[PDB]
Structures are given as C-alpha cells and as structure tokens.
Design a protein around this ligand. Structure first.
Ligand SMILES: Cc1ccc2c(c1)CC[C@@H](C(=O)Nc1nnc3n1CCCC3)O2
Length: 167
C-alpha cells in the first residue's frame, strides 16, 4: 500500500492520473519523482522547468555542478539527484526530443531507467515539448516498465484521450 490517490489502474504496474506533477510531488513526497530532462540538465521549460521552479532553482544549481563534474547525459540515459522539496530523489531521464531529430527508438531505453526503482511518480517521456506522440509514449511505458509507475498527465483533454484509447 502507498499514498498515491485517485489513479486509474491501466495494468498490473502502471497507473495514471490527470494531475500537475509538481502538485502531486508536493503532496505525496514520493521516493522518486522523474524529470523530463535533456542531456545538459538545463531545466528551462515543460516538466523540467516546472519542477525546477518549484525547487526555487535548487535543482538547476545541483544539476550545473553535476554536469561540470560528469559531462552531459546520453539520450536514453539518466542520473539520480536530490528531490529537494518534492521527493527524496529525482531521476532525471532523457527521452528523445523529436524537435531535435532524435531517434524515437531511444524511448524504450529511456523508460528502462525506471526499472531501477521500485515505485516512481513520472510524466510521459518525450511528450509535451519533446514532440513525441503521448499515446505512443504510454504504450512504450506499459511494455517496458515493470516496476510500479504513477503517471501524471497535466492536460485534462490529453488524459481523457490516453485513457479512452488505451488497449
Ligand atoms: C501533427 C501532430 C499533431 C498533434 C500532435 C502531434 C503531432 C504530436 C503530439 C500530440 C500531443 O498531444 N502532444 C502532447 N503531449 N503533452 C501535451 N501535448 C499536447 C497538448 C498539451 C500537453 O499532438
């Protein structure tokens, strides 16, 4: 039993809710919140910009030190950093950005990072400003993630389309 509330169950391990991931994280304080990161951990907009804003830019400060030490992530890769006031940890995961021409096949690799954590609060990878089809992202999530994932979808219209079209 966990404290996630109001989710629709899609499969044995995948759950979904129309919610602002920032507000969900502040309420639940999950062990892991997933960020929709880019390889430079520049959290300018989309989910990343919103999560970082909620940390009063502390996420960005920590991320800049991470990059200065380690260099950029790989597309499809991840790193674990602090969750600040939102969660114990933040798993920064880089899905492919279609608006940069990146290989959508890397979306499965991106979701594989979730399997290193027993329970996660997450957005749909590569959705939103990353330009992929969110219906496809949900399909890859369900077919790749085996751990318990609670998906937050900000847009109510999109949430209803994702549920109604789910196979
Ligand atoms: C030609 C073409 C037309 C429409 C279209 C796509 C492509 C790809 C993605 C899709 C989409 O819904 N993306 C998305 N993911 N999170 C959100 N949105 C949009 C609305 C709010 C939040 O829409």
């Amino acid at each position: 039993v966990n404290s996630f509330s109001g989710y629709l169950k899609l499969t044995d391990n995948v759950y979904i809710k129309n919610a602002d991931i920032v507000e969900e994280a502040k309420k639940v304080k999950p062990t892991v919140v997933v960020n929709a990161a880019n390889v430079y951990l520049k959290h300018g907009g989309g989910v990343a910009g919103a999560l970082n804003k909620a940390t009063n830019n502390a996420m960005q400060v920590e991320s800049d030190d991470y990059i200065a030490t380690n260099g950029p992530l790989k597309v499809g890769g991840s790193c674990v950093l602090s969750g600040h006031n939102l969660a114990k940890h933040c798993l920064h995961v880089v899905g492919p950005n279609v608006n940069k021409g990146e290989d959508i096949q890397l979306l499965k690799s991106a979701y594989e990072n979730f399997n290193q954590h027993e329970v996660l609060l997450a957005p749909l990878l590569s959705a939103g400003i990353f330009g992929a089809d969110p219906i496809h992202s949900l399909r890859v999530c369900v077919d790749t993630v085996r751990t318990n994932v609670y998906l937050a979808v900000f847009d109510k219209n999109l949430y209803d389309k994702l549920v109604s079209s789910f196979l």
